[PDB]
Design a protein around this ligand. Sequence first.
Ligand SMILES: Nc1ncnc2c1ncn2[C@@H]1O[C@H](COP(=O)(O)OP(=O)(O)OP(=O)(O)O)[C@@H](O)[C@H]1O
Ligand SMILES: Nc1ncnc2c1ncn2[C@@H]1O[C@H](COP(=O)(O)OP(=O)(O)O)[C@@H](O)[C@H]1O
Ligand SMILES: Nc1ncnc2c1ncn2[C@@H]1O[C@H](COP(=O)(O)OP(=O)(O)O)[C@@H](O)[C@H]1O
Ligand SMILES: [Mg+2]
Ligand SMILES: [Mg+2]
Lengths: 460, 458, 173, 513, 85, 52, 52
Amino acid sequence: MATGKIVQVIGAVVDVEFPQDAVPRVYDALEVQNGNERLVLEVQQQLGGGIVRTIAMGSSDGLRRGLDVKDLEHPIEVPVGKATLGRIMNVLGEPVDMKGEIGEEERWAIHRAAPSYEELSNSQELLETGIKVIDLMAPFAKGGKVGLFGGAGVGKTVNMMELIRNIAIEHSGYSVFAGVGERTREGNDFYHEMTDSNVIDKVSLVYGQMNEPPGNRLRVALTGLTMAEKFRDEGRDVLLFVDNIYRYTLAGTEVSALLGRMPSAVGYQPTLAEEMGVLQERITSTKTGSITSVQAVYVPADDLTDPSPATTFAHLDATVVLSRQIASLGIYPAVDPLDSTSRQLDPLVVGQEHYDTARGVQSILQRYQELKDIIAILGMDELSEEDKLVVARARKIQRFLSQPFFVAEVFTGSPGKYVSLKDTIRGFKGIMEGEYDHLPEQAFYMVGSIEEAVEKAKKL
Amino acid sequence: TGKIVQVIGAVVDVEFPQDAVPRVYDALEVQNGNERLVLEVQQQLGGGIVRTIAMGSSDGLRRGLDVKDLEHPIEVPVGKATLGRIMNVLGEPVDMKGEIGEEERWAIHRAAPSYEELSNSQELLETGIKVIDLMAPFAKGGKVGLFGGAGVGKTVNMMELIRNIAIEHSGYSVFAGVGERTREGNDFYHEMTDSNVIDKVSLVYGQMNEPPGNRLRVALTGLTMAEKFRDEGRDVLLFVDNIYRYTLAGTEVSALLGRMPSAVGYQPTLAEEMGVLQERITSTKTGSITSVQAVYVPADDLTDPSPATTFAHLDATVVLSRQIASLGIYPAVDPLDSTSRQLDPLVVGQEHYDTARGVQSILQRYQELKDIIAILGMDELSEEDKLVVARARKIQRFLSQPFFVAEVFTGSPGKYVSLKDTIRGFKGIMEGEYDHLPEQAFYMVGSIEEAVEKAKKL
Amino acid sequence: EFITVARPYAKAAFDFAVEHQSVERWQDMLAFAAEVTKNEQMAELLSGALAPETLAESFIAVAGEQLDENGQNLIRVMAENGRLNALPDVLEQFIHLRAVSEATAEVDVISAAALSEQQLAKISAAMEKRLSRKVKLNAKIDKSVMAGVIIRAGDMVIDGSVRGRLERLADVL
Amino acid sequence: MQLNSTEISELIKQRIAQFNVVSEAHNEGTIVSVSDGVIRIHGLADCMQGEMISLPGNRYAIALNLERDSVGAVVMGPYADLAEGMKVKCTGRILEVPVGRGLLGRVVNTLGAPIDGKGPLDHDGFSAVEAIAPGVIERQSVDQPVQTGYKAVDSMIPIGRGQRELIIGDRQTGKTALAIDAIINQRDSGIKCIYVAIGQKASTISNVVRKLEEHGALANTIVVVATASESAALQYLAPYAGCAMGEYFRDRGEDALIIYDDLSKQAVAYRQISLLLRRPPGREAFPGDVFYLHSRLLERAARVNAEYVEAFTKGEVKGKTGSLTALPIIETQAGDVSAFVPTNVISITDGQIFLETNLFNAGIRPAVNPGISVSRVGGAAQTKIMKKLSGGIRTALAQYRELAAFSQFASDLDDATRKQLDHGQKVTELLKQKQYAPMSVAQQSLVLFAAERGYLADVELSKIGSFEAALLAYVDRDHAPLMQEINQTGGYNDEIEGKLKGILDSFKATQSW
Amino acid sequence: QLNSTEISELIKQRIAQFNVVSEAHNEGTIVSVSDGVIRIHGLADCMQGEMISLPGNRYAIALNLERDSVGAVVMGPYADLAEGM
Amino acid sequence: AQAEIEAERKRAREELRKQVAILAVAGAEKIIERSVDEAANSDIVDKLVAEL
Amino acid sequence: AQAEIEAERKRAREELRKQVAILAVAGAEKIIERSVDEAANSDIVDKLVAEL
Ligand SMILES: Nc1ncnc2c1ncn2[C@@H]1O[C@H](COP(=O)(O)OP(=O)(O)OP(=O)(O)O)[C@@H](O)[C@H]1O
Ligand SMILES: Nc1ncnc2c1ncn2[C@@H]1O[C@H](COP(=O)(O)OP(=O)(O)O)[C@@H](O)[C@H]1O
Ligand SMILES: Nc1ncnc2c1ncn2[C@@H]1O[C@H](COP(=O)(O)OP(=O)(O)O)[C@@H](O)[C@H]1O
Ligand SMILES: [Mg+2]
Ligand SMILES: [Mg+2]
């Protein structure tokens, strides 16, 4: 039965008054009949006097005062498990594609505590991505956060699709994609690019886009996360994509200003760091399973000091930057080896050979970076015959970072390659010390492992 | 007679019978558990309520406690008996020794002297510090201020001035520690007792461990002692350890007294809280007070309201800077911002004045050149501009000096450079007499004759 | 809530009703004036802005059970400040001030089941030592406190239940 | 073996034995509001500020305001499940925390409740979380040395027992590495350690705990943890719970060492708690008293003279003197050391070790920037040998690091700069040191000897790194008694100068490296 | 909620007589004191900018004329002035 | 590897103590609810009043 | 050692079952002293035994 009544409505914020003894607890979900359809309200505060203040997970137009409100006794619950693969959902777990119901056996609340201290894994492993640039220059910690910083046209979404493919096929995990606050168009022509690549059967999509009320854009990141947590509890390894964490922070600021709390550092809510932490703290490697996150980060005003980036970066373990220039040079994936970083590049955690190989190729490329500007102005003739060999090797290292993805076949017909880590370490140990100086640079381009680079070189 | 009714932070509120309500600045008392807590009233709210600031820890206070109305303000021991002893803000002895045998006690809230009574002195005061008494000479019986951000050296400079002025001087002295480290108060106390000058210094301490109620008023009870020694016909030295904390303790409390915030959060009464203090610390016809005040500037920002309102209250302002201490050039005084009321040809003599203005002129001309040096490199300078850069970089070093109190940090022994000798050395550098020495000959030396020797070693 | 704004009005009403020896009449008058405030149509009138003297005059007219000068004067003052909604709490604080003035108390006794009719007498006999006040034990039952008794006097409670002892044990372990 | 049913049964039976069946009278109130972590309570006519109010479940709320009609309190834990109308109880206790040496080796919540699995605590009673530090007369001047594992800070930035030394730098610069290298090195030097992590990631805390247990230090540390997920009222009150445990050893004439990991995150949690109470912000939106917050915490770290110990301890401990060293860690954005919070702390401590991202990315690790870093006690804290061997080295490098600036294109004074510039370069190449590799006063002393007495400018810059690895084994084989004496006493004499010259000559001549 | 100089011993007078006795419009009483500002109760005939004369030889300037208050600023030392003057 | 097992002995011991300790109080609840249904209540309510 | 602990755990776990019946009585009869609680206890205590 319905035991409450709406008492105020101001934009997205609805105040309802309950009996003195039956007040909903915070984060509980209410629902009202907004005319011809139901609307769900998530509680935020218990003002005194039986009243409680809530945010509508939808449009609030048409809400009269005095409507009846039905108090559900539990937080927002969403469907989880295998049944949600290949489907699309909005925050509240309703199917938002046209395929009909979800036959899920189980539903979970989206608010829960992070893994307690002694549940965490007593180890520190690497997620083998199968991509040369990533696995060499910016390895992924299994159960860590990764920030993907490139812009547009550089291939962010094809990178994400290749990661989905590799984590589902070569390992035996699933993936979740939470589209926080981004263009509807991109969500549509991402969903389509994934169905025509047959990865759609291994990823579960949830969408809250720019057109949604603040209550939708805010919590959607927790729905995807609480599906990934279900896959984790089944003992799997999961990969969780957040389409823009900055818009998560911004939906938090909008809701905060709606509730009327004082602003803090640069207009951001007072609870910025906690709203971020209670999300980023559920993405970890428990003894049973892992969640690994790949999070597209937008940095406002090109400022790495603004409180939003300054908070996000405190949680990221790796950082891969995509570059327009490396793309125009025709190398794909267009990762930037110099700006990409990972705090797993330490001899202790990755070993000495991997470490010093990555460091070597980095120094090679960053000398070439200036030899190229010598050449630009003085011409190739001026260089020492040491630097001409440095250039000839830098160009081959640069080529060897290219790779054919299983998902890129559509574009280039070449069958995609999965490059185990050992092969990358060997390939670069090789090139960097003159071995394979005897074969041309185009024999490295788009090849795969080096034990295929030679066999391509054989028949140019 | 009277009950507590709210205890928000440090501001307690008390309700009194309509006819018994205390006056402003009266002192109340509460029996806080197994403690005795003193409250000072700030406002008479309406209807018998009165609002107060707790001179102690506010924890443990319940609503409804009985409070006792003392009929007099906070009063502190005063006179010769308070000499060579450490005291609380409340005038209680804080060393382990016995009672203070004071004859007399004075209320710490007083009116400033009248305009008719003030007195002026051009009598210059000599300190061994080179930069200070070249750029910012200051006069017996006048305020000095050491402005600077954290870590820049405004406490080492004050201990140097204590060493150079206070031991070579006969009258009594007062050191009021407002909101700075207790470690340093202990180190100072033992440094005095280990040279027997303790029995001429009177100490008061409201160090940073203490609650706001103590740091707020501790400076006034140091004044109230220096004021006695002044009115007795003596002349006194008064060193205040950080007068910035006297306003910060006010900002901390103002929000609770229900007062709308001003420009950067500060209390709306900032300039008056500061004036009513800085105005009682002045010399007069019956005596004189010579005072050095350390003045913290927050976030190194000299435009902040709290430093900005203080410049007007001082005679000689010495402004330290971090971008000079980072070059190792101690004392890191900024000679293009240090100033003095006394740097005038009639007060200081024409030659000293012309030397100071020459140093400023060419350090400034050096400042203008730095952008083109940083972009185009030094080689694009005129041939008589490279000369200016090379003389300015010499002057910058020669303003450096090794203090007697910085041995702990550098080993090298201290120096005391008389005025007659610094105004000769700087003429030497400016007129190109020493235009054949390497810069490092001038770093951390005393007279110009110690630079020329050091140059023999390279 | 109005507890903090009802205090001055309650104290003034009681300070006045004492001097004229009219506490018993003032309490009933205040209770009536509080009950009118709860009415369907009157509460609507009290919200929508209306000139205080006009709101008071419309309010007085609904109360012929108010003494000719002082009750109506209280209503006028509260209407001027715009606090007529506070009345239901001016009543609470008036009754509490009276209970203090008459050195009287009123305590709950919560039990698994009713008591022996001498146990009540012994409880009251005990309580009038803890409290100087004369006490009226109004008794209640709650079988979740399956044995023992809870005594609550104001914001002091003395918990003699078995349920209490079990919850207190289960956390010592 | 140690899962004997009978001992568990007796452990419980004891609790049954000493159970006070007698009731007790307590004071009660009702929750009236809940929002974003703050509670509003009616009643509690006898709650006292700073008190612990006990909620349903087993959790506490701290009274911050006693307004005229309501008490304002912050929940110390998850607050979602609290509902208007719930009853609460006023305990008689100002905020308290368990203390004792029985905590050593335990990982503990900010309220003392153990967070590892290893069961309840053994503790010597309780101590108040908010206390006022010893006064000016109870102190003593810091004299004794605290050795970290490192050349760079033990020579240039010495730390004494009872000092407060800020570690400040950018993020990912080796602040926590240097801190837990300080903790590991006291594994055997008799001073107990405490590591309080505020706002850290939970995984990182489990990782540092794993290293602490792996190098054998954990049995000598207390670990206080309030992770990024936990309510702000826990994070902002965490370091006071750490000082409450450090002060247990300070007062008993023992020595302690406490590390506040990222006081920046404590300031952020306090800014949150403040703004949710509608208090007027100030500079950078921090509250007005964000200074006093750190002031009253770091000031507790102190060294107390023996009369204070004898008075506190009721005359049981005689003649000894206690101390509590503190190493707060601050993070600064973009290397800007002039922001409101970094300056507030630079103004409270007795120095700072500034770790520079530009050196750290160049391979110089630990990336100690000389010129910004200082120790406000300086040489008083060093062992007799070190105060000699150090010379003015820190200004030597602070100069070399601007001779290296102007010498980027052209310079004068050529051949003297040549040798200044080579000494500086091989010295910096010598001060870099690997992680988890602490070197003793005797190991570090002979290396500074080899640095300042020549034995240099001949060996290759690439060989500096192995000259050391060979020398420290050569002296570990042959002259071990001399290392054993220099470790036992600071010991500076011209017998030891002679012996060190002899050892280093014989190494330079006989051995390969 | 907030109270605005509605306090027990004022309210009692209205209880006894709400229709205010025509008390001299030439005078009032101090109800509050703080930081150099005083709130005066009464003074129906106060005019903005007028000078209000206090015990001793002191004056205040009426700046805020409100409903049931006159907010005036004291000229010279204010610490002496006490509610009920 | 030895401390790593010592910690596990401690942790398992505690894990077991927890279960025994909660089942104790559950058993006391039911036992108490079976046996105080009599005039035993009259003793409890009279016990505190002598100390009340 | 982790496999050995899984044996020691069960070894102790089985035997404690006989001690829960002692501890439940000790607690309940601490909290209310006027009970034999041995006359009619089988239904309660045997499923206390069972849970461990
Ligand atoms: N002496 C050293 N030599 C080489 N690498 C080091 C050294 N000290 C620390 N590091 C490396 O620096 C990295 C970051 O160290 P650490 O986490 O202690 O810095 P931090 O400032 O605590 O980072 P954060 O601020 O993110 O916690 C570590 O991965 C460690 O491997
Ligand atoms: N690895 C790759 N193989 C083949 N083509 C690629 C690859 N990466 C990027 N491209 C081309 O670059 C274009 C990038 O466009 P798009 O993927 O829409 O950018 P984003 O995904 O960043 O929004 C793609 O259309 C694709 O044709
Ligand atoms: N004359 C000096 N010689 C050498 N070092 C100095 C000198 N003055 C300051 N310093 C260094 O700068 C620090 C400044 O100390 P202090 O003045 O106490 O700081 P603050 O200015 O914040 O009070 C000293 O600890 C010392 O390390
Ligand atoms: Mg100082
Ligand atoms: Mg760290």
